[PDB]
Amino acid sequence: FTEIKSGFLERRSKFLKSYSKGYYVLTPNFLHEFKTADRKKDLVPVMSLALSECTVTEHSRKNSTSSTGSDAKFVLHAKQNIIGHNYVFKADSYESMMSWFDNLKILTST
Amino acid sequence: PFTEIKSGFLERRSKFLKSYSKGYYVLTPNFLHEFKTADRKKDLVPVMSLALSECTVTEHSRKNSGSDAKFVLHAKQRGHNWVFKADSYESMMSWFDNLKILTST
Amino acid sequence: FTEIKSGFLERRSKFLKSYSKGYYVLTPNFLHEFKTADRKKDLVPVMSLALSECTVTEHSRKNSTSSTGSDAKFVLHAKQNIIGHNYVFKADSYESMMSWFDNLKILTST
Amino acid sequence: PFTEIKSGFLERRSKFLKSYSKGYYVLTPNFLHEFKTADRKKDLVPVMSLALSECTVTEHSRKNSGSDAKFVLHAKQRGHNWVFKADSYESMMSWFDNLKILTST
């Protein structure tokens, strides 16, 4: 819109060992977080992460094991000071995770 | 924001504070972003991101013939009207026209 | 994609007094014509009309009368030399026509 | 094409004719367009419009340390590989990177 990908992801809290869910939109420039999927009424990102200073490092394998989504996670790494502290995201499936990861890898590659 | 369509300094008016503040604006197909500085390598988090899908540009200054370099950006969710001021009528018209074609829907 | 509008339009031949149908995509910059609606395999416009040198002039009223689509036409005018010779387009309905026209009017306005 | 992301002169190689030809390229979110000239007011019909949705940028020159300012644009519908040459490695890398982020899907 122009968007590369959009959908729900859960993001892990380092300290709280829990996840929070948001609706994410990946553009050529940013990973934006929104509270909802209503693109007509929910238009202010709660957060926008600039891809220029991120990298995606690891991701689950289809066979990765242990509770939910053990095969559906990826790590987004910061290269500049949101502090490089890593964000762990969890998608709904391996296939969905790989779609996010494959796009992020090219957008953040060198 | 390297799918940038246009960028440059603009002043934006605050209604309540009765003052202008200059920011560095970047227009993409999705947003008009405000950043504090023009350093696209170190200043990466927008101060503000205005979704183009619910903005329209309505009026602008008539050229002199006081600043004639202003335009209004209107919001729907709702009745909001930001006033911007560019360096010249010419620069204002570039912003206005570029915003217009990204906000026709 | 980024697109403002897309859909089927019929375009009139001045000399032949007949219409030909295409799939059109309106962007902030162009009115593109494609042979089909398959955005995955049909990717070369047969024609791209630059909006910078077009204007939309008249359009049908909901009550415009006489054979098909008498309430669904609009005229796209050229301001520079595709020669200003006018193109007449016909949409599927008044409502659809107005969507095309309203967008074109702002994109080509002064 | 005023939602232009990038524009500039590039040389494109013809495989059959064994020659380069310089054109003025305009990158939008949808296409890489070739125009004969840089006159955006009088030269309005693209010579060629390459749909980004089915292109990828694959390889590029390594910096010198012969031109080191080339990159390959690959097509799917299918196996097509256009070679482009920019004025410098630096200019080539700007094209390459801007194309890359519009062609990740």
Residue numbers in the entry:
A (entry chain B), C (entry chain B): 467 to 532, 536 to 550, 553 to 554, 557 to 583
B (entry chain A), D (entry chain A): 466 to 530, 538 to 549, 555 to 582
What's written in the study?
The PH domain-containing protein Slm1 from S. cerevisiae is a component of the target of rapamycin complex 2 (TORC2) signaling pathway. We have previously reported that in vitro, the Slm1-PH domain (Slm1-PH) interacts with liposomes containing PtdIns(4,5)P2 and DHS-1P cooperatively. The core of each monomer consists of seven antiparallel β-strands with a C-terminal amphipathic α-helix connected via a long and flexible loop.
The phosphoserine contacts the β1-β2 region and the β5-β6 loop through the same key residues as Ins(4)P. Specifically, the hydroxyl group of Tyr485 hydrogen bonds with the nitrogen atom of phosphoserine (hydrogen bond length  = 2.9 Å) and the NH2 group of Arg478 interacts with the oxygen atom of phosphoserine (hydrogen bond length  = 2.8 Å). In addition, the ε-amino group of Lys542 from the β5-β6 loop and the ε-amino group of Lys562 from the β7-strand also interact with the phosphate group of the phosphoserine molecule (hydrogen bond lengths  = 2.4 Å and 2.7 Å, respectively). The non-canonical binding site accommodated anions from the crystallization conditions, and also the phosphoserine molecule. In addition, all structures in complex with ligands show regions of additional density between the bottom of the β1-β2 loop and the N-terminus of Slm1-PH. Intriguingly, we could not assign any ligand to these extra densities.
